[PDB]
Design a protein around this ligand. Structure first.
Ligand SMILES: CN(CCO)c1ccc(-c2nc3ccccc3c(=O)[nH]2)cc1
Ligand SMILES: [Zn+2]
Lengths: 161, 47
């Protein structure tokens, strides 16, 4: 039941999403090994993901969390990169989308930095890079990220390197 | 998936070394995220 609606580049919603994407690029400690060498993106398309069942699944859980946390969902907009983005938009997030070996345990990971999520588009550590050229820094192949609405609720703070 | 720490709904990974890094977050229930935008892009080669 998922439909994708193209946003026009003239739409303020396109513009605010692109700005969050571009403005949260940073340099990475791997010198670009995982995600490639870049300071900015060429945005080709931004689509709104519309699925009523998946939305209601989200809002149901959001209310449960809010009610456990003095009516505060602690909702953020965060990036997610994954080889399974096309599965996620159709079927929703679930245990198959978790990073089993992540540093905070087996869960589903999101980043404030778009460039952090970009490191996972082709797999953990960038895998072997793009399907066509086997290049983790490919400047030709089209990449996809998700910009996601995420309920944090009461979040456990881990200070970490 | 693992469970959230008891009495919590997520984990926040705060950077403690790289002063320019932003936070990362983990949820343990797929229902706590909705994929609102699909962004298609290329990375650009620095000039
Ligand atoms: C499903 N999978 C491959 C192992 O299941 C996986 C998907 C996404 C990510 C991922 N990890 C991150 C870790 C820190 C910050 C951002 C991300 C991210 O966007 N995706 C990792 C593994
Ligand atoms: Zn390529």
């Amino acid at each position: 039941g998922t439909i994708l609606i193209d946003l026009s580049p003239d739409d303020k919603e396109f513009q605010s999403v692109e700005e969050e994407m571009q403005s949260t690029v940073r340099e990475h400690r791997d010198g670009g090994h995982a995600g490639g060498i870049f300071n900015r993106y060429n945005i080709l398309k931004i689509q709104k993901v519309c699925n009523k069942k998946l939305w209601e699944r989200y809002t149901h859980r959001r209310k449960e969390v809010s009610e456990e946390n003095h009516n505060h969902a602690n909702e953020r907009m965060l990036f997610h990169g994954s080889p399974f983005v096309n599965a996620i938009i159709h079927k929703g997030f679930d245990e198959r989308h978790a990073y089993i070996g992540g540093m905070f345990g087996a869960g589903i990971y999101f980043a404030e930095n778009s460039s952090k999520s970009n490191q996972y588009v082709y797999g953990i550590g960038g895998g072997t890079g793009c399907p066509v050229h086997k290049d983790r820094s490919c400047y030709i192949c089209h990449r996809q990220l998700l910009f996601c609405r995420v309920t944090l609720g009461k979040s456990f703070l881990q200070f970490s390197a | 998936m693992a469970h959230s720490p008891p009495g919590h709904h997520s984990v926040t990974g705060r950077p403690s070394v790289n002063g320019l890094a932003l936070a990362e977050y983990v949820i343990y229930r797929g229902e706590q995220a909705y994929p609102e935008y699909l962004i298609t892009y290329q990375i650009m080669r620095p000039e």
